[PDB]
Design a protein around this ligand. Structure first.
Ligand SMILES: O=C(O)CNC(=O)C(=O)O
Ligand SMILES: [Mg+2]
Ligand code: NI
Ligand SMILES: [Zn+2]
Length: 331
């Protein structure tokens, strides 16, 4: 069995190996990469996502989210307070202001310490989930707006033809902006490219151990657990590495830098934070190996998780017994 300790693997494809996306995912899985729940892919030196970022300040963040925390430093939830629209140029200047900028620090480890010590005491503003792409249309390799769609994968594997579309999303971050513990919708893969700016630190639980994380989350967030049997779908709960280690939960951590891709694998719980002003692009995708995870994915039916148009068909075809209850939650 490859990668039995479920370590995060780092790949360096050649320009030739970067041509065929599906083939390279299958290669990484041949080497056991999926066991970690997360992999890093460093693009060949010849590749570029686009020529420059000199022209992005006019992108609109229609609904910036202020991430307000409640709890204790290692175990907290966050709620998203909607703020007035602002441009990416306006947001970058806010990120760089004295109130929001990254503090002086020695290295990534010191900055991680400061994040877990002090996150709850601030409310950073996140530009999340903005439909769009920063890949040049002429970038042919690993262009997140030109991937095979999840609807097409389901049709190729299962024969069924369904509505829905699959497009990328932009994330503009600042110091302390936070992504809560979650798996993807329908336990899909994700791919995330850090276009520019400061790093993103990731934490991940191996898929084979995901239920250990869920059981701890039920203990740590007991009212949330009574409210919903899949409350991590709400994407609001944080648990620190110190707390995870105290409770014996297997996990790993890695820092993504600008120019690097991360892949999350089906049912790989992940969480993390941004080091400073940055911009990432991410999209969900599927492979044949996903289908069995899609069929078993938990679902939020309490009404909180509220998701995309395209998830309807995935529930309806893969989980027909759950469809009626889940759709009541959506409506
Ligand atoms: O970058 C972020 O804020 C969060 N992204 C992801 O959870 C992802 O790519 O799967
Ligand atoms: Mg612009
Ligand atoms: Ni994710
Ligand atoms: Zn719920």
């Amino acid at each position: 069995a490859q990668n039995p300790n479920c370590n995060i693997m780092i790949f360096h494809p050649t320009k030739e190996e970067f041509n065929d996306f599906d083939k390279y995912i299958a290669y990484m899985e041949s080497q056991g990469a999926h066991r970690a729940g997360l992999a890093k892919i460093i693009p060949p030196k010849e590749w570029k996502a686009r020529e420059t970022y000199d022209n992005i300040s006019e992108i609109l963040i229609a609904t910036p989210l202020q991430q307000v925390a409640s709890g204790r430093a290692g175990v907290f939830t966050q709620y998203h307070k909607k703020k007035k629209a602002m441009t990416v140029g306006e947001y970058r200047h806010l990120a760089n202001s004295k109130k929001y900028q990254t503090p002086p620090h020695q290295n990534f480890e010191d900055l991680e310490r400061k994040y877990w010590k002090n996150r709850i005491y601030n409310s950073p503003i996140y530009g999340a989930d903005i439909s769009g792409s920063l890949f040049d249309e002429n970038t042919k390799q690993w262009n997140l707006g030109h991937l095979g769609t999840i609807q097409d994968l389901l049709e190729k594997e299962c024969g069924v033809v369904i509505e829905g579309v699959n497009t990328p999303y932009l994330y503009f971050g600042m110091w302390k902006t936070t992504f809560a513990w979650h798996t993807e919708d329908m336990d899909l893969y994700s791919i995330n490219y850090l276009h520019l700016g400061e790093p993103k630190t990731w934490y991940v639980v191996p898929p084979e151990h995901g239920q250990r994380l869920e059981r701890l989350a039920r203990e740590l967030f007991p009212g949330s657990s009574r409210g919903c049997g899949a409350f991590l779908r709400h994407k609001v709960a944080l648990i620190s590495p110190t707390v995870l280690k105290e409770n014996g939960i297997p996990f790993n951590r890695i820092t993504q830098e600008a120019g690097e891709f991360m892949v999350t694998f089906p049912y790989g719980y992940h969480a993390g934070f941004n080091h400073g002003f940055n911009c990432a692009e991410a999209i969900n995708f599927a492979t044949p190996r996903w289908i069995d995870y899609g069929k078993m994915a938990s679902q939020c039916s309490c009404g909180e998780a509220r998701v995309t148009f395209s998830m309807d068909a995935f529930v309806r075809i893969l989980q027909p017994e759950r469809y009626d209850l889940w759709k009541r939650g959506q409506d």
